[PDB]
């Protein structure tokens, strides 16, 4: 991807399961490194807004420059800024491919898009940051409809969100409509991230 | 045809056309005046008279206006 380090270490430090399951904060729900077991003090006001930003950023696996650019894009549309930001992140072709169920992990959904296994509205899209619009159709390229990564992920039929429609036999998905804040991760207090970019 | 600029002022030598320049920052109107050397033909007007002037082609090194009408006698 971009960051190729331990996602277990990042989930323990941030106090949020990045895999979405909870196996990382399983035995050691404390920060990595030498001073992990030793319990540190409270977090400052800056340290709380910053930790919220890193929660979102490392979940969607983006660099800070791209992350801040998406925030500015989201701040131009009518509505609540922080919620528009969460909606825009969920519309990434990176995250749509994972939310549909074509990959086990969010990092696997990135390599599929990056390596050109995915089509959008019938044409190849190689860009993980591609911003899928409602009504679009995401499918798998013909030479890759029988690959073990895609096959194994599809048979574990997880909760495909209600703003998405997938057809497992067709290996094809539909971006029905824009998500709502309730359909998006609730462990992120996005009001802190808006404050973080105000200072 | 077309219109030539007209001013009204007082003779200061035988024309002063005092106007206001609003301050750019503070908004207060400040009086300022500019002397318009004008052509009187037969030396008709005198000091302190309030006169009307109209713009013309250059008549000398500094004269660009002609005295058309006398408004208030000295």
């Amino acid at each position: 991807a971009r960051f190729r380090g331990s996602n277990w270490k990042k989930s323990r430090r941030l106090g949020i399961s990045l895999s979405g399951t909870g196996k990382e904060l399983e035995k050691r729900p404390y920060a990595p490194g030498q001073h992990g077991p030793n319990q540190r003090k409270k977090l400052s006001e800056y340290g709380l807004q910053l930790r919220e930003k890193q929660k979102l950023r490392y979940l969607y696996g983006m660099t800070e420059r791209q992350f801040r650019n998406t925030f500015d894009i989201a701040g131009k549309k009518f509505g609540v800024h922080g919620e528009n930001f969460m909606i825009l992140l969920a519309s990434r072709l990176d995250a749509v491919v994972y939310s549909l169920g074509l990959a086990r992990t969010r990092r696997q959904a990135r390599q599929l898009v990056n390596h050109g296994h995915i089509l959008v509205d019938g044409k190849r899209v190689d860009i993980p940051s591609y911003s899928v619009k409602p009504g679009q159709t995401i499918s798998v390229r013909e030479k890759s409809q029988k690959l073990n990564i895609i096959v194994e992920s599809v048979e574990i039929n997880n909760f495909v969100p209600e703003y998405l429609n997938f057809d497992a036999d067709s290996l094809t998905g539909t971006f029905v409509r824009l998500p709502e804040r309730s359909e998006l991760p609730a462990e992120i207090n996005e009001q802190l991230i808006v404050e973080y970019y105000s200072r | 045809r077309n219109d030539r600029k007209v001013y009204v002022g007082k003779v200061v030598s035988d024309v002063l056309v005092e106007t206001y320049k609003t301050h750019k920052l503070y908004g207060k109107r400040v009086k300022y005046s500019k002397k318009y050397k004008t052509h009187d033909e037969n030396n008709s007007a005198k000091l302190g008279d309030i006169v009307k002037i109209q713009e013309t082609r250059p008549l000398s090194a500094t004269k660009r206006f002609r005295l058309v009408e006398i408004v208030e006698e000295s």
Binding site: - | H23, L25, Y26, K28, V30
Partner: protein, 134 residues
Amino acid sequence: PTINQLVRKPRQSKIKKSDSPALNKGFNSKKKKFTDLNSPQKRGVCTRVGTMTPKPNSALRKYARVRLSNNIEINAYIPGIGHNLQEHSVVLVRGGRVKDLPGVRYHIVRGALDTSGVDGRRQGRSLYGTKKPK
């Protein structure tokens, strides 16, 4: 003041002064005149290297006397542990005054021109002109 006083005598902001005046001047040799250019660094020649004692602090702080390319004399601090400088050395000088050393307003750039990098440095090497080991 009153609005009329402000119209008669408008506000005037304080003029800011530069902390590194020797960097913001050039010299035209042909016209024998001084320019104003805002350079980030200046080349110079070491006139006298040596040491100086600090103002609570106590040490022997290494420095050099430098004649810059604009014919201005300055005192520049030599950061890091050991240096290879002496008289007639060609050095690059940047801004940044060193506290506790009165009259030293500039720094010598380690690893530029004749100044060597700090020997044995392994952390923050780019601040001391040291190449990556191995």
